[PDB]
Enzyme design. Sequence first.
Site, PDB file in Angstrom:
ATOM      1  N   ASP A  39      61.119 -19.715  40.558  1.00  0.00           N
ATOM      2  CA  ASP A  39      59.777 -19.997  40.042  1.00  0.00           C
ATOM      3  C   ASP A  39      58.768 -18.998  40.613  1.00  0.00           C
ATOM      4  O   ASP A  39      58.168 -19.246  41.661  1.00  0.00           O
ATOM      5  CB  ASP A  39      59.410 -21.438  40.398  1.00  0.00           C
ATOM      6  CG  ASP A  39      58.101 -21.894  39.777  1.00  0.00           C
ATOM      7  OD1 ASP A  39      57.374 -21.060  39.196  1.00  0.00           O
ATOM      8  OD2 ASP A  39      57.809 -23.099  39.876  1.00  0.00           O
ATOM      9  N   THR A  40      58.559 -17.877  39.915  1.00  0.00           N
ATOM     10  CA  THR A  40      57.665 -16.847  40.435  1.00  0.00           C
ATOM     11  C   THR A  40      56.208 -17.297  40.457  1.00  0.00           C
ATOM     12  O   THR A  40      55.394 -16.688  41.162  1.00  0.00           O
ATOM     13  CB  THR A  40      57.804 -15.555  39.621  1.00  0.00           C
ATOM     14  OG1 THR A  40      57.522 -15.814  38.239  1.00  0.00           O
ATOM     15  CG2 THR A  40      59.217 -14.983  39.759  1.00  0.00           C
ATOM     16  N   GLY A  41      55.863 -18.345  39.711  1.00  0.00           N
ATOM     17  CA  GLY A  41      54.529 -18.912  39.766  1.00  0.00           C
ATOM     18  C   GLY A  41      54.280 -19.862  40.913  1.00  0.00           C
ATOM     19  O   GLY A  41      53.171 -20.391  41.040  1.00  0.00           O
TER      20      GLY A  41
END
EC number: 3.4.23.16
Lengths: 99, 99
Positions: free
Chosen positions: B25-27
């Site tokens: 989850d890069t966010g």
Amino acid sequence: PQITLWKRPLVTIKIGGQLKEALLDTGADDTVLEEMNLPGRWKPKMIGGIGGFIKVRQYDQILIEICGHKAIGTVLVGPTPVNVIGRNLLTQIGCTLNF
Amino acid sequence: PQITLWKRPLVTIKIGGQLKEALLDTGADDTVLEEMNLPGRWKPKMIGGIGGFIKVRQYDQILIEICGHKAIGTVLVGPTPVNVIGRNLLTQIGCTLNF
Ligand SMILES: CCOP(=O)(COc1ccc(C[C@H](NC(=O)O[C@H]2CO[C@H]3OCC[C@H]32)[C@H](O)CN(CC(CC)CC)S(=O)(=O)c2ccc3c(c2)OCO3)cc1)OCC
């Protein structure tokens, strides 16, 4: 390009004739943008994450440009605390995770 | 590996000796796992997502292996909708975005 993750992966996007900053978010199924008065019809939707759900307006067939890469797809608009580019558009610009 | 985003970037992780599935989850700034028993001291913390804030237990310097890559960092445990690997550990395994 290649984006490391030391900091938030923020990029400039163009949507509805406006430039904005948005997160390249592999954890977002959908693209969710801060409140903006886009033209055309929309459908109500609710999306959930940490803390619960928010109400958003679903717009279909919206053109977004991301780092010069053009895409077209569904964009959700509502009181999100951050603009997130989701997988529905990340696939269209050829974005992968690599390690 | 190189991971495309037509489906959720789910991977197997190992933490506290137990296998689990988690979303890359890069966010997410932080790594947040669903309720589980972890050994060691913890401190109460608050984190905010798209729908508000939740209470989590913060475990520091936890060993966690992500798709066969080892990391040692902070893991938050609480009522997250899904297990997410955030940037604090993605950087450790050398994960980048590429398009
Ligand atoms: C200005 C103040 O900001 P703020 O603190 C919040 O700011 C942020 C910053 C980043 C995000 C993005 C979010 N990251 C996140 O939650 O990370 C938290 C852990 O690490 C911290 O780092 C940032 C926050 C903390 C995920 O990447 C994606 N999410 C789903 C994901 C949940 C974890 C998997 C289910 S999702 O957004 O909910 C979502 C998007 C599209 C969808 C959908 C659900 O369903 C269909 O389509 C959201 C809010 O306010 C608090 C009130």
